[PDB]
Amino acid sequence: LYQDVNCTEVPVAIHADQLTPTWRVYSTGSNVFQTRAGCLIGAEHVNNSYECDIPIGAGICASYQTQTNSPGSASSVASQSIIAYTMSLGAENSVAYS
């Protein structure tokens, strides 16, 4: 994680300026996207939110396995890898008040 900086000045000659509003970011889904707090390499953003594992900042936490405290089987050599996500603020609940 390059902190409080933008991964733009780093040497890159493989891409040509295409006149893009945001750092030529054309993704089909939740693929790695630049963050204002810092530039992270090695994790993919996920829309879903879970309990914080490794706090970083601005509510962004990183976790290795793509699940939280599973009583069952852990991670494997499969496509699952490190992810960075907005920690789930508590647990949603509803109270029947009258």
Partner: protein, 439 residues
């Protein structure tokens, strides 16, 4: 010896307490601060060694404890609670302090007024104008102010999360009362929550209902007074503003100290190298590095004192939240002046705010009291409440409010004789059994 004062009316006063929780997270790098891309200066600086490594460790520990303090103060319940879509509380209106669903940002009205009460600028368009600053609007982000690598690490917890925690706690208090803090949340009407709280302070809940609606108004008006407290007093947020000002002054002073000569020929390493030869300039460079290291050590020590102050404030804030907000505290003057009824938390930039709703007598009247009553040789002591007299008749009223009632054997028991008590008086006690035997 024979005069007592009994309250005949009560008022619901509300106060505010601002408690710092955290502060700006700072970090200083030895290399850039002391040496500007010069190999010789770096080589000389590495001689000291572990000083910079321990200063960085101390700063990291300060940041970790500052984050933990905020987590403890706010993140206390794993379950997030929300208010019902229909706002019915028997007369109470928390919409002023509750988040506004219409506004895209879930910020309470109180926070909006706190932000507005500071001197802002009209030259342009007010789109965002400060998302983290402690109630001001300034120029460009830390990168603008970072000309020596004085990086400011963003806080782990965002203001939106703090506001969500405060809203959840407030909703639990309104709906679940204090049950959620002691275990699983238990829904209960708000009008029935104040009934138990009055009994907690020795006031029978019977008054509440008789003035329930009125009490609600007394509560509502109190909220309005809070707004006046902002107009008539700008020192409510004095603690947070003073802390921010002190931190900014310390950072600025540390920045200007870079230009201090410390008895050298010049305050710039490049000028010294250009005008003066390296080998003889070694002494001047060493002296400058020593001075900068001493200044950094002094700044770090001051930061340690500030961190100790902030943690001490945050521990008290968390204790109050656990006691004042989640439950009911019997400690006097701990949850605000007067008998404690409840407390509402509110987010604040690098701090927290507590609004203490309390019970305070309003009108008091004098009465003639006696230690006890002994009619037929057997004394009669009050189980609850103190005897009062208007000059002709003797009545029994509850401890913290005027509510005279006919004296009966149900509310008193027999202990001792007439002689044993000192100052005792004689009176007749209504016996429910006697009229029944007449028929």
């Amino acid at each position: 010896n024979n005069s007592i004062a009994i309250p005949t009316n009560f008022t619901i006063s509300v106060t505010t307490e601002i408690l710092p929780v955290s502060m700006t997270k700072t970090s200083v790098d030895c290399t850039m601060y002391i040496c500007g891309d010069s190999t010789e200066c770096s080589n000389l600086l590495l001689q000291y060694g572990s000083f910079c490594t321990q200063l960085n460790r101390a700063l990291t520990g300060i940041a970790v404890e500052q984050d933990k303090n905020t987590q403890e103060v706010f993140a206390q319940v794993k379950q997030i609670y929300k208010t019902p879509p229909i706002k019915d509380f028997g007369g109470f209106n928390f919409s002023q302090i509750l988040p506004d669903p219409s506004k895209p940002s879930k910020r309470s009205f109180i926070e909006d007024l706190l932000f507005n009460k500071v001197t802002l600028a009209d030259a342009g368009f007010i789109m965002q104008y400060g998302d983290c600053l402690g109630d001001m609007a300034y120029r460009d982000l830390i990168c603008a102010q970072k000309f020596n690598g004085l990086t400011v690490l963003p806080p782990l917890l965002t203001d939106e999360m703090i506001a969500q925690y405060t809203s959840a706690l407030l909703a639990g208090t309104i709906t679940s009362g204090w049950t959620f803090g002691a275990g699983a949340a238990l829904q209960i009407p708000f009008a029935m929550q104040m009934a138990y709280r009055f009994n907690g302070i020795g006031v029978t809940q019977n008054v509440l209902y008789e003035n329930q609606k009125l009490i609600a108004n007394q509560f509502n008006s109190a909220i309005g007074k809070i707004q006046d407290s902002l107009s008539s007093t700008a020192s409510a947020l004095g603690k947070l503003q003073d802390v921010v000002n002190q931190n900014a002054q310390a950072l600025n002073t540390l920045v200007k100290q870079l230009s201090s000569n410390f008895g050298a020929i010049s305050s710039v390493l490049n000028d010294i190298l250009s005008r003066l030869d390296p080998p003889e300039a070694e002494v001047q460079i060493d002296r400058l590095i020593t001075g900068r290291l001493q200044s950094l050590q002094t700044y770090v020590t001051q930061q340690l004192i500030r961190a100790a102050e902030i943690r001490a404030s945050a521990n008290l804030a968390a204790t109050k939240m656990s006691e004042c907000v989640l439950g009911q505290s019997k400690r006097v003057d701990f949850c605000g002046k007067g008998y404690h009824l409840m407390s509402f938390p509110q987010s604040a930039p690098h701090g927290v705010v507590f609004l203490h709703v309390t019970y305070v007598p309003a009108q008091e009247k004098n009465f003639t009291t006696a230690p006890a009553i002994c009619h037929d040789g057997k004394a009669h002591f009050p189980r609850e409440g103190v005897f009062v007299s208007n000059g002709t008749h003797w009545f029994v009223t509850q401890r913290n409010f005027y509510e005279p009632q006919i004296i009966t054997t149900d509310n008193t028991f027999v202990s001792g004789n007439c002689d044993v008590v000192i100052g005792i008086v004689n009176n007749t006690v209504y016996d429910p059994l006697q009229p029944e035997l007449d028929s």
